[PDB]
C-alpha cells in the first residue's frame, strides 16, 4: 500500500583524510554513500549483500564490506578507499605490485583486493590467527597459505587469484 | 529496504527500554545480517538502535575462573583474544572457520547467534516459506533441500541454524546474558535458546520483546585437544555442509556438537559419554531421531565419517 | 585488405614490441578506482535518476494486470515503466526472450516494470510496492524429462555421419557407452548488468556494459524503433562478460526507456539476486558417447549425440562439435537433440559448446584407454588427426595437440603417476593425476581500425573493439607500435565506443586476431601515407626508432606530419582460407587433486596447461586468460550448478553465495606453456584464440584426476563429495 519517506540525518565522515559533511537517508549503505554521494567510484559493488568484496574499505584501519554497514553508524570515522591509498602518477606499493604481477583482469574485483591486501599484512603483523594458522597461540606467519585464505573474502571471476598471491608476496617482502 | 529511524543512546539500559517504547524497532550491530535482510524486506523495522558504543565490547575473566564476553565484542577480536585461543581454542577455529576477514571484523558475538537461515526459498520472497510466512508451505521439503538440515526438523521447516561459533559455544555450556526492557536480567543456557520449528518455524529463540543481549559467559576452561572441523565445498568462505566441533581428554572421553544438521547446534549428553567406544555409536545415539531427504540423506554418513576423522586426529 | 592467402613475412615478424610481456596500459587506471564502469560515469549525467527492475515472480504464464499507483506514489519516484506504457517494442535478432515481459511471462525473473526515482534507495522501496498479477501456465522444467521425447535433430542442424558407426562399434575390440550431464551454468561477471542514458531530442546516448558494442546498438535501436544512426554506445570497461554480456539485456532497454519517458537521465543496474534467472546460463547438457578402438587402441568408431533444453527458438549448446574434428575415426554420428524448457534463455557461456562437449568426451576418451591399457597421453597421441575425419582433404592449417600433451607430460611428471588408482596418500589425502585435451576452432570476423599519427609522434588506435579483462588496450597498442615503429608508451588506444570503427568485439575468441588485423590494415595504410609524405617508396621503407628509412634516404616521424596529422581507416576481411584448411587450437591440461579420505571434499593442488594458439601476442595477459579459465574450469568440476526447481520453474540459488565460484583458498600453482604455434594461414597477425580455449578439457583433467585418486568415476558434473562419498575408504 505505501512506503515511508527518507529519514535525512547529518553526518560527518574523514574520508581519505578529508573531512565530508553530508545529509543522508539512514538506509544508506557507507558503500552507496562513496559511489553516488561522493562520486568515489573506485569503491564497486559486486553484489550488495557481504558475498564478494568488491566493496571492501578500510574504516579506522579495519577492512569491512561498505555495502553490509549505514554510512550513520560511522560518524566521525576515519575511511579509506583505493582512491587514498594512491592514483596513476603516485602508484600505492601494493597497486603497482598488481601491475606488474598482472594480478586484475576486468579490473572490477581489484579494489577490493587491493584494500584488503594491505589490511591483511597488517592483520598478519598484529598476530591475528586465521583458518590455517597451525599453532593458535604462537604468533602467524606470512605464509602463501595464510594469505590465500585471509583473501578467499575476495572474489575475482577472472580467476587473476595466482597473481594477485605474486602480487601481495612481492610487496610483502 | 524500508525507511527508518535511526537512534544512538548512552546506555544498554536505554537501548533496551527504546526497544519496547517503539513498535518494530530492532537492535542493529554488525549489520552484517540483518541489512542483508532489510535489503530485501525480510526484516521491515521502522526503528534501529545502534549497539555498539555501549561498553557491550569488553572480555574478562570472570570470578568463577570463566570468561565473559560482550555482546557486541567483533568476531575477529574474540578469536584474536589471547586467553580464548589457549584456553577455549574451539571457540576461536569456529570463528576463524566461518565467514570473511571483512564480515569477521564488523560481526558481533550476539549477533552471530541471532543470524538467520541461509535458506534460498527464504531468501526469495516470492517462494513458499513458512518462516517467513506461516502456512504459506515449505519449498525446500521436497525441493532443493541438499544444504537442509537432517535431524530436529519437522514437516513445517527443516532448515540448519548456520552459525559455526555457536556450534563452539553449545560445546562450551555458554551462557547468553541478556536484560528485559523491563530492567531485569536472564540467563539462558544455550542448550536452551533456540526453539525447534514445530509448527512455529517463525518463532525462533528464547528472546522477548526488546530484548537485549549484553554478554556471553563461559564457564572454566576444559583443557584436552580442541578440534573444530568443518566440512564444505570449497575451501573457504561457505557455510557448513557438517561441522564437527569437539574436546577431546587424554583419556578418549570428551565432548562434540556438530552444525549444520540442525536448527540449532547438535550436541547430546549420552552421545558424549561413548565417545571412547568411537564414532559409530556416538553417531548412532545422535542420528537416532533423524529425518533426512534424498537429497540431504549424505549429511549422515558425512557426519559419521567426519566424526571418526575428528577422533583419529586426537589419537595422533 | 582482403586476407585470402596465407600471410608471408611482414612487419609483426619483428616482434620488437608484439610477443612481448608488456604491462597492461588500463593498469593504472584499474588498479586506482579511476576507470569508470557504467554505473560510475557521474560528470556525464549529474542529476541521472535511479531505475529499479521489477522481475517477474512466476516462470510462465500471463500477466493479466500490473498496478503502479502505490509506487507512483511513493517517495521521490518520478515513473513506472512497463509494457503497457512503453508503447510498441520490436526485438533484437540476440534475443530469444523479449526484454520486457508483458502480457506473456516467458520466464522467471523476466523485466515487468522499472520504477524510476531520485535517488537509488527510493526506487528500490517503490519497486517493492508494483503489485503484479498473473495466470500461470503448465511449464516444461526438466532436461531429463523431456529427453526422452525428443530424437531428432533441429531442421537446420541435421546429424553428422560418416561411414558405418553402428558396424565399426559391434566389430571394435574395446569400447564404452556412458552417459554425462553438465549442470546450468552461470556467468557470475563480478560487475552487475548496468546502462545509464541520456536522450537529446530523438539521439541516445547508452553508456553501458557489453562484449559487443555494434551488436548493441543495432539491436538496441531495432527494439526501440529508432534510426540506428541515433543511437550511440558507450563500454570502456566492462567487469566481466565471460558471454553473458555479448547481447542486449533489460538493464540497456529499460534505462533508455526511462530516460526517454522521464526526459532526464536514468541509470539501472540489474541486482545480482536477479541476474541469473533474468540474464543468460549455459544450458545444461545429457550427453550419449559411444566410442569403439581396435587392437591397437585406434579408434574407429566415434557416437557423440547431445540434449540441452532453452525456450521455443533458443539455440542448442553445440556439444558434439570437437567430436568430429578432435579425434580419428574412420566410422562417426554426431547428433543435437533440442528441448523446449520455460527456464530462463539459455545462451552463451564462456566456450560455448566446446567446455560441456569436452567435459564429456574427455572423461570418455579416459575410460576407453583404462579399457584398452593404453597409458591416456598415448591413446590421445595414437588417435591424432591432422585432417578433417569427415573430409581427408581437408588439413588442419596448424595442429599441435600432441606438442601439447607430451611437452605437458614432461613438465608435469605425468610419469610419476601410478595407474592403479586410490594408492596414492599424503596423509588423510587420496592423491590423483588427470589429464585432458583442449579444442576450440579459430573463428574469422571482418575488423576496421582508425589509427592516427599525431603532429607530436604519438600515435591514436580507435575502433569499437573491447576490452574485458582479456588485455585488447594492451595488445592493439602494441600492434602499433610495433607497425610503426614506436615505443609502446605512445600509442594511445581508444575502445568501446560506436562512434569508433566497427571490429569484430570480444566473442568466440576471434577479437584478440581480428581486432589487431584490423590495427594491422590501417597502419599499412598509414605506412603508405606517411611514406608518400616524405616522398619514399612504401614498399622499400622501414619503420624504426621513430623514424621512416629508404635504402640511403631516411626521414622522422615529426617530418611526415608537419603538413598536419596522418589518419587511416581501414578493415580486415576474411575469405576462403578457414574452409581450404580447418583452422583450430589446442590445448593439454594436466592437473593433480586431492581427495580427502574421510569427507569427499576436492582440493586441486596443482595444474598445467600447455596450450597451442598462433602466436602469442602478450604472454603476459595471455597466460592470465588461461590461469582464469583454469579456474573457471576448477568451478564448472567441483561446485558450480544453477539448481533447478522442476515444480516452480527457476534458478533457486540465484546468487553470490548460493552458486559456488572459486575463491583464493581453492587455487593451486598454475602454470601456463605457450607452444610456438605461429599460424600464417590465420590472418597477418598470426595470431589465434586463447581466451576460450583455456577452459576447454580443465573440468574432464580435473573428473579424471579425482578418479585416479580414488576409482571412482562421476559422470554428473559437478563432483561434489556427496558423489564421492559411500565409495571411499574407511
Ligand atoms: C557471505 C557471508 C558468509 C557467511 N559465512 C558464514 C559462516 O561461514 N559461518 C558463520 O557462522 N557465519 C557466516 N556468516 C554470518 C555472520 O557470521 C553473521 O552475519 C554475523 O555474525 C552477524 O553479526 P552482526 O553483529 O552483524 O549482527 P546484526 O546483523 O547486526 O544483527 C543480527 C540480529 O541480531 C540482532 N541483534 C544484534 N545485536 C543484538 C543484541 N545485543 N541483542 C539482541 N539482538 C541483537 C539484530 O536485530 C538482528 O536480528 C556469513 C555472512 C555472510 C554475508
Ligand atoms: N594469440 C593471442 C590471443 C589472445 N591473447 C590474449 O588474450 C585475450 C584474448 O583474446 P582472445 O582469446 O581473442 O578473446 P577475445 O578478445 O575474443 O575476448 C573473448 C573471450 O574472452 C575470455 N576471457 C575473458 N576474460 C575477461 N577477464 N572477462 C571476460 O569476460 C571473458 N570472456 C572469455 C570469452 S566468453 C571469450 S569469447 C587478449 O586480449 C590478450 O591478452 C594474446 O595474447 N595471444
Ligand atoms: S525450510 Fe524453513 S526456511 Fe527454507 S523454506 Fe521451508 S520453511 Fe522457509
Ligand atoms: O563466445 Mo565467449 O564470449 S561465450
Ligand atoms: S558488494 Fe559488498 S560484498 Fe559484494
Ligand atoms: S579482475 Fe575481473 S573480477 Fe577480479
Ligand atoms: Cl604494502
Ligand atoms: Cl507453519
Ligand atoms: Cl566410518
Ligand atoms: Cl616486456
Ligand atoms: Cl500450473
Ligand atoms: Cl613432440
Ligand atoms: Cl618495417
Ligand atoms: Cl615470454
Ligand atoms: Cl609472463
Ligand atoms: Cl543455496
Given at each position: 500500500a505505501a512506503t515511508p519517506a527518507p529519514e535525512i540525518m547529518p553526518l560527518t565522515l574523514k574520508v581519505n583524510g578529508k573531512t565530508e559533511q553530508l545529509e543522508v537517508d539512514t538506509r544508506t549503505t557507507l558503500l552507496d554513500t562513496l559511489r553516488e554521494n561522493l562520486h568515489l567510484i573506485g569503491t564497486k559493488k559486486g553484489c550488495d549483500h557481504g558475498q564478494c568484496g568488491a566493496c571492501?574499505?578500510?574504516?579506522?584501519?579495519?577492512?569491512?564490506?561498505?555495502?553490509?554497514?549505514?554510512?550513520?553508524?560511522?560518524?566521525?570515522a576515519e575511511i579509506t578507499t583505493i582512491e587514498g591509498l594512491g592514483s596513476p602518477d603516485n602508484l600505492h606499493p601494493m597497486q603497482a605490485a598488481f601491475i606488474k604481477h598482472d594480478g586484475f583482469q576486468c579490473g572490477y574485483c581489484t579494489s577490493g583486493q587491493i584494500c584488503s591486501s594491505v589490511a591483511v599484512?597488517?592483520?598478519?603483523?598484529?598476530?591475528?590467527?586465521?583458518?590455517?594458522?597451525?599453532?593458535?597461540?604462537?604468533?602467524?606467519?606470512?605464509?602463501?597459505?595464510?594469505?590465500?585464505?585471509?583473501?578467499?573474502?575476495?572474489?575475482?571471476?577472472?580467476?587473476?587469484?595466482?597473481?594477485?598471491?605474486?602480487?601481495?608476496?612481492?610487496?610483502?617482502? | 529496504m524500508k525507511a527508518f529511524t535511526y537512534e544512538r543512546v548512552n546506555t544498554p539500559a536505554e537501548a533496551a527500554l527504546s526497544a519496547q517504547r517503539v513498535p518494530g524497532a530492532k537492535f542493529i550491530a554488525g549489520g552484517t545480517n540483518l541489512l542483508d535482510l532489510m535489503k530485501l524486506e525480510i526484516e521491515t523495522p521502522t526503528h534501529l538502535i545502534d549497539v555498539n558504543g555501549l561498553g557491550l565490547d569488553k572480555i574478562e575473566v570472570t570470578?568463577?575462573?570463566?570468561?565473559?564476553?560482550?555482546?557486541?565484542?567483533?568476531?575477529?577480536?574474540?578469536?584474536?583474544?589471547?586467553?580464548?585461543?589457549?584456553?577455549?581454542?574451539?571457540?576461536?577455529?569456529?570463528?576463524?572457520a566461518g565467514a570473511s576477514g571483512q564480515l569477521r571484523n564488523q560481526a558481533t558475538t550476539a549477533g552471530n547467534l541471532l543470524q538467520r537461515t541461509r535458506c534460498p526459498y527464504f531468501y526469495d520472497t516470492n517462494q513458499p516459506c513458512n518462516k517467513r510466512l506461516p502456512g504459506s508451505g515449505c519449498a525446500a521439503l521436497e525441493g532443493f533441500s541438499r544444504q537442509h538440515a537432517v535431524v530436529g526438523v519437522s514437516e513445517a521447516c527443516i532448515a540448519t541454524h548456520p552459525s559455526d561459533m555457536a556450534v563452539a559455544m553449545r560445546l562450551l555450556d555458554a551462557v547468553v546474558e541478556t536484560i528485559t526492557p523491563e530492567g531485569k536480567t536472564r540467563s539462558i543456557t544455550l542448550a536452551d535458546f533456540y526453539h525447534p520449528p514445530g509448527k512455529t518455524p517463525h518463532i525462533e529463540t528464547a528472546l522477548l520483546p526488546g530484548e537485549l543481549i549484553v554478554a556471553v559467559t563461559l564457564p572454566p576452561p576444559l583443557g584436552g585437544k580442541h578440534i573444530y572441523r568443518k566440512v564444505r565445498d570449497r575451501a573457504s568462505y561457505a557455510f557448513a555442509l557438517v561441522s564437527v566441533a569437539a574436546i577431546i581428554q587424554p583419556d578418549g572421553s570428551g565432548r562434540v556438537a556438530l552444525g549444520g544438521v540442525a536448527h540449532k547446534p547438535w550436541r547430546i549428553e549420552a552421545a558424549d559419554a561413548q565417545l571412547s567406544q568411537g564414532a559409530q555409536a556416538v553417531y548412532d545415539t545422535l542420528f537416532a531421531s533423524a529425518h533426512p531427504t534424498a537429497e540431504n540423506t549424505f549429511k549422515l554418513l558425512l557426519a559419521k565419517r567426519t566424526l571418526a576423522s575428528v577422533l583419529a586426529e586426537a589419537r595422533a | 585488405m582482403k586476407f585470402d592467402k596465407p600471410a608471408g613475412e611482414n612487419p609483426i615478424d619483428q616482434?620488437?614490441?608484439?610477443?612481448?610481456?608488456?604491462?597492461r596500459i588500463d593498469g593504472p587506471l584499474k588498479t586506482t578506482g579511476t576507470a569508470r564502469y557504467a554505473y560510475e560515469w557521474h560528470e556525464e549525467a549529474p542529476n541521472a535518476a535511479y531505475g529499479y527492475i521489477v522481475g517477474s515472480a512466476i516462470a510462465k504464464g500471463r500477466?493479466?494486470?500490473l498496478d503502479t499507483d502505490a509506487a507512483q506514489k511513493a517517495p521521490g519516484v518520478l515513473a513506472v515503466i512497463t509494457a503497457s506504457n512503453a508503447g510498441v517494442l520490436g526485438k533484437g535478432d540476440k534475443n530469444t526472450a523479449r526484454l520486457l515481459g508483458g502480457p506473456t511471462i516467458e520466464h522467471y525473473h523476466?523485466?515487468?516494470?522499472l520504477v524510476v526515482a531520485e535517488t537509488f534507495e527510493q526506487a528500490r522501496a517503490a519497486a517493492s510496492l508494483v503489485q503484479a498479477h498473473y495466470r500461470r501456465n503448465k511449464g516444461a522444467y526438466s532436461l531429463a524429462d523431456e529427453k526422452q521425447a525428443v530424437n531428432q535433430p533441429p531442421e537446420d542442424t541435421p546429424d553428422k555421419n560418416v561411414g558405418d558407426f553402428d558396424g565399426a562399434f559391434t566389430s571394435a575390440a574395446v569400447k564404452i557407452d556412458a552417459t554425462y550431464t553438465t549442470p546450468d551454468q552461470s556467468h557470475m561477471a563480478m560487475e552487475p548488468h548496468a546502462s545509464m542514458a541520456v536522450w537529446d531530442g530523438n539521439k541516445l546516448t547508452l553508456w553501458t556494459s557489453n562484449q559487443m558494442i555494434d551488436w548493441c546498438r543495432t539491436d538496441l535501436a531495432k527494439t526501440l524503433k529508432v534510426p540506428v544512426e541515433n543511437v550511440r554506445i558507450i563500454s570502456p570497461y566492462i567487469g566481466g562478460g565471460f558471454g553473458g554480456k555479448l547481447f542486449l539485456r533489460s538493464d540497456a532497454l529499460l534505462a533508455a526507456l526511462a530516460a526517454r519517458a522521464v526526459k532526464r537521465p536514468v541509470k539501472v543496474m540489474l541486482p545480482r539476486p536477479s541476474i541469473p534467472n533474468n540474464t543468460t546460463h549455459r544450458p545444461a547438457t545429457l550427453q550419449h558417447l559411444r566410442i569403439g578402438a581396435d587392437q591397437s587402441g585406434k579408434i574407429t568408431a566415434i557416437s557423440h549425440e547431445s540434449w540441452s533444453g532453452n525456450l521455443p527458438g533458443g539455440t542448442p549448446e553445440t556439444a558434439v562439435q570437437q567430436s568430429e574434428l578432435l579425434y580419428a575415426g574412420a566410422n562417426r554420428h554426431t547428433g543435437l537433440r533440442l528441448a523446449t524448457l520455460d527456464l530462463p534463455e539459455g545462451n552463451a557461456m564462456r566456450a560455448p559448446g566446446e567446455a560441456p562437449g569436452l567435459m564429456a568426451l574427455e572423461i570418455a576418451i579416459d575410460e576407453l584407454a583404462?579399457?584398452?591399457?593404453?597409458?591416456?597421453?598415448?591413446?590421445?597421441?595414437?588417435?591424432?588427426?591432422?585432417?578433417?575425419?569427415?573430409?581427408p582433404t581437408r588439413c588442419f592449417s596448424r595442429r599441435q595437440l600432441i606438442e601439447c600433451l607430451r611437452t605437458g607430460a614432461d613438465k608435469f611428471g605425468w610419469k610419476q603417476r601410478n595407474a592403479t588408482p586410490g594408492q596414492v596418500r599424503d596423509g588423510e589425502w587420496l592423491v590423483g593425476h588427470g589429464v585432458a585435451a583442449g579444442f576450440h576452432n579459430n573463428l574469422l570476423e571482418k575488423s576496421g581500425a582508425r589509427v592516427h599519427?599525431?603532429?607530436?609522434?604519438?600515435?591514436?588506435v580507435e575502433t569499437d573493439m573491447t576490452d574485458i579483462g582479456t588485455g585488447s588496450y594492451t595488445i592493439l597498442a602494441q600492434t602499433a607500435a610495433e607497425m610503426l615503429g614506436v615505443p609502446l608508451e605512445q600509442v594511445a588506444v581508444h575502445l568501446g565506443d560506436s562512434s569508433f570503427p566497427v571490429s569484430a568485439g570480444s566473442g568466440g575468441q576471434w577479437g584478440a586476431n581480428t581486432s589487431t588485423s584490423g590495427v594491422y590494415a590501417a597502419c599499412m595504410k598509414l605506412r603508405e601515407m606517411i611514406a608518400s609524405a616524405v616522398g619514399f617508396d612504401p614498399e622499400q621503407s622501414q619503420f624504426a626508432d621513430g623514424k621512416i628509412t629508404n635504402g640511403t634516404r631516411s626521414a622522422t616521424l615529426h617530418e611526415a606530419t608537419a603538413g598536419g596529422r596522418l589518419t587511416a581507416e581501414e578493415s580486415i576481411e576474411f575469405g576462403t582460407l578457414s574452409k581450404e584448411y580447418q583452422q583450430s587450437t589446442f590445448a593439454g591440461h594436466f592437473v593433480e587433486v586431492g581427495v580427502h579420505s574421510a569427507t569427499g571434499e576436492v582440493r586441486v593442488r596443482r595444474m598445467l596447461a600447455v596450450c597451442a594458439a598462433g602466436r602469442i601476442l602478450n604472454p603476459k595477459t595471455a597466460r592470465s586468460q588461461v590461469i582464469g579459465a583454469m579456474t573457471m574450469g576448477m568451478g564448472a568440476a567441483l561446485m558450480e550448478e544453477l539448481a533447478v526447481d522442476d515444480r516452480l520453474g527457476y534458478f533457486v540459488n540465484h546468487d553470490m553465495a548460493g552458486y559456488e565460484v572459486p575463491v583464493h583458498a581453492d587455487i593451486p600453482k598454475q602454470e601456463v606453456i605457450f607452444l610456438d604455434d605461429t599460424d600464417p594461414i590465420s590472418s597477418p597477425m598470426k595470431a589465434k584464440g586463447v581466451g576460450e580455449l583455456g577452459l576447454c578439457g580443465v573440468s574432464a583433467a580435473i573428473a579424471n584426476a579425482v578418479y585416479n585418486a580414488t576409482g571412482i568415476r562421476v559422470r554428473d558434473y559437478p563432483i561434489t563429495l556427496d558423489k564421492l562419498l559411500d565409495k571411499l575408504p574407511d
Open positions: 571492501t574499505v578500510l574504516v579506522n584501519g579495519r577492512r569491512l564490506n561498505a555495502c553490509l554497514t549505514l554510512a550513520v553508524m560511522h560518524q566521525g599484512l597488517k592483520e598478519i603483523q598484529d598476530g591475528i590467527p586465521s583458518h590455517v594458522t597451525v599453532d593458535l597461540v604462537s604468533a602467524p606467519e606470512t605464509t602463501a597459505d595464510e594469505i590465500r585464505e585471509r583473501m578467499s573474502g575476495n572474489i575475482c571471476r577472472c580467476g587473476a587469484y595466482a597473481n594477485i598471491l605474486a602480487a601481495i608476496e612481492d610487496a610483502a617482502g | 570470578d568463577a575462573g570463566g570468561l565473559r564476553i560482550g555482546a557486541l565484542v567483533r568476531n575477529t577480536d574474540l578469536a584474536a583474544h589471547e586467553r580464548v585461543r589457549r584456553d577455549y581454542a574451539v571457540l576461536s577455529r569456529a570463528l576463524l | 616482434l620488437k614490441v608484439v610477443g612481448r610481456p608488456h604491462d500477466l493479466t494486470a523476466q523485466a515487468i516494470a583404462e579399457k584398452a591399457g593404453i597409458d591416456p597421453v598415448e591413446f590421445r597421441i595414437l588417435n591424432d588427426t591432422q585432417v578433417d575425419p569427415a573430409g599519427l599525431e603532429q607530436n609522434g604519438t600515435v591514436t
